[PDB]
Amino acid sequence: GWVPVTKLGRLVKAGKITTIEEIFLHSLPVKEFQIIDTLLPGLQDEVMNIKPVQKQTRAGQRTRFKAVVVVGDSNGHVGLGIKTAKEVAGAIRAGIIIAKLSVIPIRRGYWGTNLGQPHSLATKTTGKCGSVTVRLIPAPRGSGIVASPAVKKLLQLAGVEDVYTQSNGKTRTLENTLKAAFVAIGNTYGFLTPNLWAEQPLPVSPLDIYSDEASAQ
Amino acid sequence: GKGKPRGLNSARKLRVHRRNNRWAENNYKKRLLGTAFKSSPFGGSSHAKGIVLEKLGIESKQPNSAIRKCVRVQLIKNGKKVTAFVPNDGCLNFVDENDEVLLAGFGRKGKAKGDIPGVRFKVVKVSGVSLLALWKEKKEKPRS
Amino acid sequence: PRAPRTYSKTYSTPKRPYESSRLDAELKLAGEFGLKNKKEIYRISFQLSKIRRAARDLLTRDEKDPKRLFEGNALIRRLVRVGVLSEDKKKLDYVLALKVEDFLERRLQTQVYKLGLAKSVHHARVLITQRHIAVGKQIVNIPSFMVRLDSEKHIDFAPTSPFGGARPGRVARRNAARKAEASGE
Amino acid sequence: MENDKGQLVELYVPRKCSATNRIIKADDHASVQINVAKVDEEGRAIPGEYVTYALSGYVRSRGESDDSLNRLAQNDGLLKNVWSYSR
RNA sequence: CCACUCGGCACCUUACGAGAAAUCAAAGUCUUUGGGUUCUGGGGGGAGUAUGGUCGCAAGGCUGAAACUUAAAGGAAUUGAC
RNA sequence: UCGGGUCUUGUAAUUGGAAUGAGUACAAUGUAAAUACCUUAACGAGGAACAAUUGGAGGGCAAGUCUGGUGCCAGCAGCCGCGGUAAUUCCAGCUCCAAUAGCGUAUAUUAAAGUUGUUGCAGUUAAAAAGCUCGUAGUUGAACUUUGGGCCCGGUUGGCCGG
């Protein structure tokens, strides 16, 4: 049994929040991966890289392991986590955890018409990390993912079906590339379109409707 | 504005700028000066024939110590003396001197660290005979 | 000095040669459909590529244009005639979600096995290439025949073939002749 | 965003800012949502009825959220004689 | 001295933004890539060498190669072991 | 519990009855005459040989934690390269991989190359702002010179109908 320590966490444990769309709606900082695990039960991780790094720690040459892990729904919820640890499997597990924490949604949209489900993205987007820039362009239906297999796998863990990609910079260093692609798919909920010009009233948080609950006793 | 003209009546400056800056490439300068037609030993061809003048025990020292098996040839089409590598035969038992040899190109980049050479050419045929099928023992070599 | 007779290629080499997911998917297709070459997959990929290019370059033109409606109806009707595209999906948008298995299911290769005329897909290709199967009256022995929809109610055995008609084959009457001679002997 | 059936196909509608009307995204933690309490005739706050404001992390980080919230309050009649539109 | 205004040489913060980084109020408004315009570079050597032209009393300057050779040469930042 | 059937594997150079063209060939078609093709009497396989090859098995890049020899022609050879009684890396065998009537190699070109950049490069320190200014050709060049309103006409889609 998991006990929370945060009042977001004991809201999530109380069954008072159903989806993460409240948390995504209210820009909340998450600090409990159990929230992500209880709200994304069909969240499927995948390791991207495990690599031994040789440390020099207080006259000791040792071997730790850098694990770059991506978690991701088959719908539009992605997460990236990079972790160095003394063991392989501990680095795997804590990289999974860090990817559970940094889950962001995506806005996958249409190309051209308005039929069925959104398959491609909704606009062009761009992410940068290091010198790696990744540019995402919408694609017609059934065109696959034109991307390098790391980036392609990070997009397959998003439910992005159709996208053209172009990069620039030294894309050899794959963690800069995955971070830049992660920024590019995070910025899709960041570009204001005319179909979202409609003024909306500000809804209240769960922090005050459920303020009498979930307080530290 | 990015250090180049953008005026709508300025195509001339742009194309003169490109024709001046394409001489800084490698393939363009070799290609439009007729470099291969003048100084390359094949004269701009994919293969060549020649006559063996010598067998050579070239030495590759550092960091790999090996005894390279090569052949000094004089080409028939040019009168050009070219050394070339011959693979897979420790004895060079399919090669004698004063034989005719079909040579091709060979892309080994030798090092400067230990004066190891990469000669430019490999031996494809000796005396008309496929050197591979000699070494794989599928044909026999007429010995003159 | 004549008319230089035209021709073309039909398959397409994939871009990267060793790509484990692609190798596994291609081999799953070959196992489900009884192929022999990767080129037999690359052919269907190339044809689907040309169809998708025609589609996505007709999509950029606005509707109520005669070129778009004309060539679109030609393409859609031609796909419906072979049963690759279904009846409800008669729009340009649904031909882009149309995949390779939809083509590969419409082969004579496949339709012999799927009508219950063979025991195996491999046995289906075998009965094709040994000249046992006719469509209407004409005998077909290419497995890539790509059965049009209206031709489905005509696939049967041939009147030439011993399974469908005339006298048993070489091995059968050879063994019958050896039996009759040995009973005489 | 909707489909051809006219039903909406998005995960969530984002909150927009109020000072600059831009999108408050799912991880803007420097942004801020403000509640101001509706008062009674006696000057008691109504417990569950607020007027809300949204002040994004760019707005708040630039050093403008005070002045902009003064503007929004006086334009909504919560201040008076504070925010002057001419300077 | 106080308050304002131009026009300078410099300073000091930050980062909204940029950059690989040191850093930058420009080295910003650049993949969401276009204000105008001049010049320059295309891995390292060979080599600013050879030749030709031109300028000069001279010293030299400007212009300026190829053959050949090679998997690095680099720029910034980071740690502690002789 | 036994065993009652439904599948699907693996083998067992275990067994069974089948199918058919490569090839040969009466004939006929074919053709100026032929050869070949499409037809077709009569033969034509367990196929232990009607025998599928070409390049690989460190990484790039799919495939060996396998055995022997080498280790005086050998840590080796597009690139990086890694032990030497004990090698995933030389030679051979077994096994496995890729495409398959085709596979490899050399040369050239294109893509990858946003390393020629109009789209679309870079110039503080990584290559590169002439020592500075004048100035001709070239390129580029502030704003402003009938707005607004009203009338009628008939189209080509969409609905509210369906006549």
Swiss-Prot record, chain A:
<dbReference type="GO" id="GO:0006364">
    <property type="term" value="P:rRNA processing"/>
</dbReference>
<dbReference type="GO" id="GO:0070181">
    <property type="term" value="F:small ribosomal subunit rRNA binding"/>
</dbReference>
<dbReference type="InterPro" id="IPR013810">
    <property type="entry name" value="Ribosomal_uS5_N"/>
</dbReference>
<keyword id="KW-0687">Ribonucleoprotein</keyword>
<dbReference type="GO" id="GO:0000054">
    <property type="term" value="P:ribosomal subunit export from nucleus"/>
</dbReference>
<dbReference type="Pfam" id="PF03719">
    <property type="entry name" value="Ribosomal_S5_C"/>
</dbReference>
<keyword id="KW-0539">Nucleus</keyword>
<dbReference type="GO" id="GO:0006412">
    <property type="term" value="P:translation"/>
</dbReference>
<dbReference type="Pfam" id="PF00333">
    <property type="entry name" value="Ribosomal_S5"/>
</dbReference>
<dbReference type="GO" id="GO:0005730">
    <property type="term" value="C:nucleolus"/>
</dbReference>
<dbReference type="GO" id="GO:0005654">
    <property type="term" value="C:nucleoplasm"/>
</dbReference>
<keyword id="KW-0007">Acetylation</keyword>
UniProtKB/Swiss-Prot annotation, chain B:
<keyword id="KW-0379">Hydroxylation</keyword>
<dbReference type="InterPro" id="IPR005680">
    <property type="entry name" value="Ribosomal_uS12_euk/arc"/>
</dbReference>
<feature type="cross-link" description="Glycyl lysine isopeptide (Lys-Gly) (interchain with G-Cter in ubiquitin)">
    <location>
        <position position="55"/>
    </location>
</feature>
<dbReference type="GO" id="GO:0006450">
    <property type="term" value="P:regulation of translational fidelity"/>
</dbReference>
<keyword id="KW-0689">Ribosomal protein</keyword>
<dbReference type="GO" id="GO:0005840">
    <property type="term" value="C:ribosome"/>
</dbReference>
<dbReference type="GO" id="GO:0000462">
    <property type="term" value="P:maturation of SSU-rRNA from tricistronic rRNA transcript (SSU-rRNA, 5.8S rRNA, LSU-rRNA)"/>
</dbReference>
<comment type="function">
    <text>Component of the ribosome, a large ribonucleoprotein complex responsible for the synthesis of proteins in the cell. The small ribosomal subunit (SSU) binds messenger RNAs (mRNAs) and translates the encoded message by selecting cognate aminoacyl-transfer RNA (tRNA) molecules. The large subunit (LSU) contains the ribosomal catalytic site termed the peptidyl transferase center (PTC), which catalyzes the formation of peptide bonds, thereby polymerizing the amino acids delivered by tRNAs into a polypeptide chain.</text>
</comment>
<feature type="modified residue" description="3,4-dihydroxyproline">
    <location>
        <position position="63"/>
    </location>
</feature>
<dbReference type="InterPro" id="IPR012340">
    <property type="entry name" value="NA-bd_OB-fold"/>
</dbReference>
<comment type="subunit">
    <text>Component of the small ribosomal subunit (SSU). Mature yeast ribosomes consist of a small (40S) and a large (60S) subunit. The 40S small subunit contains 1 molecule of ribosomal RNA (18S rRNA) and 33 different proteins (encoded by 57 genes). The large 60S subunit contains 3 rRNA molecules (25S, 5.8S and 5S rRNA) and 46 different proteins (encoded by 81 genes).</text>
</comment>
<keyword id="KW-0963">Cytoplasm</keyword>
UniProtKB/Swiss-Prot annotation, chain C:
<dbReference type="GO" id="GO:0003735">
    <property type="term" value="F:structural constituent of ribosome"/>
</dbReference>
<keyword id="KW-0687">Ribonucleoprotein</keyword>
<feature type="domain" description="S4 RNA-binding">
    <location>
        <begin position="106"/>
        <end position="180"/>
    </location>
</feature>
<dbReference type="GO" id="GO:0032040">
    <property type="term" value="C:small-subunit processome"/>
</dbReference>
<feature type="modified residue" description="Phosphoserine">
    <location>
        <position position="183"/>
    </location>
</feature>
<keyword id="KW-0963">Cytoplasm</keyword>
<dbReference type="InterPro" id="IPR002942">
    <property type="entry name" value="S4_RNA-bd"/>
</dbReference>
<dbReference type="Pfam" id="PF01479">
    <property type="entry name" value="S4"/>
</dbReference>
<dbReference type="InterPro" id="IPR036986">
    <property type="entry name" value="S4_RNA-bd_sf"/>
</dbReference>
<dbReference type="GO" id="GO:0005737">
    <property type="term" value="C:cytoplasm"/>
</dbReference>
<dbReference type="InterPro" id="IPR001912">
    <property type="entry name" value="Ribosomal_uS4_N"/>
</dbReference>
<dbReference type="GO" id="GO:0022627">
    <property type="term" value="C:cytosolic small ribosomal subunit"/>
</dbReference>
Swiss-Prot record, chain D:
<dbReference type="GO" id="GO:0000461">
    <property type="term" value="P:endonucleolytic cleavage to generate mature 3'-end of SSU-rRNA from (SSU-rRNA, 5.8S rRNA, LSU-rRNA)"/>
</dbReference>
<keyword id="KW-0687">Ribonucleoprotein</keyword>
<keyword id="KW-0689">Ribosomal protein</keyword>
<keyword id="KW-0698">rRNA processing</keyword>
<dbReference type="GO" id="GO:0022627">
    <property type="term" value="C:cytosolic small ribosomal subunit"/>
</dbReference>
<dbReference type="InterPro" id="IPR001931">
    <property type="entry name" value="Ribosomal_eS21"/>
</dbReference>
<dbReference type="InterPro" id="IPR018279">
    <property type="entry name" value="Ribosomal_eS21_CS"/>
</dbReference>
<comment type="function">
    <text>Component of the ribosome, a large ribonucleoprotein complex responsible for the synthesis of proteins in the cell. The small ribosomal subunit (SSU) binds messenger RNAs (mRNAs) and translates the encoded message by selecting cognate aminoacyl-transfer RNA (tRNA) molecules. The large subunit (LSU) contains the ribosomal catalytic site termed the peptidyl transferase center (PTC), which catalyzes the formation of peptide bonds, thereby polymerizing the amino acids delivered by tRNAs into a polypeptide chain.</text>
</comment>
<dbReference type="GO" id="GO:0003735">
    <property type="term" value="F:structural constituent of ribosome"/>
</dbReference>
<comment type="subunit">
    <text>Component of the small ribosomal subunit (SSU). Mature yeast ribosomes consist of a small (40S) and a large (60S) subunit. The 40S small subunit contains 1 molecule of ribosomal RNA (18S rRNA) and 33 different proteins (encoded by 57 genes). The large 60S subunit contains 3 rRNA molecules (25S, 5.8S and 5S rRNA) and 46 different proteins (encoded by 81 genes).</text>
</comment>
<dbReference type="GO" id="GO:0000447">
    <property type="term" value="P:endonucleolytic cleavage in ITS1 to separate SSU-rRNA from 5.8S rRNA and LSU-rRNA from tricistronic rRNA transcript (SSU-rRNA, 5.8S rRNA, LSU-rRNA)"/>
</dbReference>
<feature type="modified residue" description="N-acetylmethionine">
    <location>
        <position position="1"/>
    </location>
</feature>
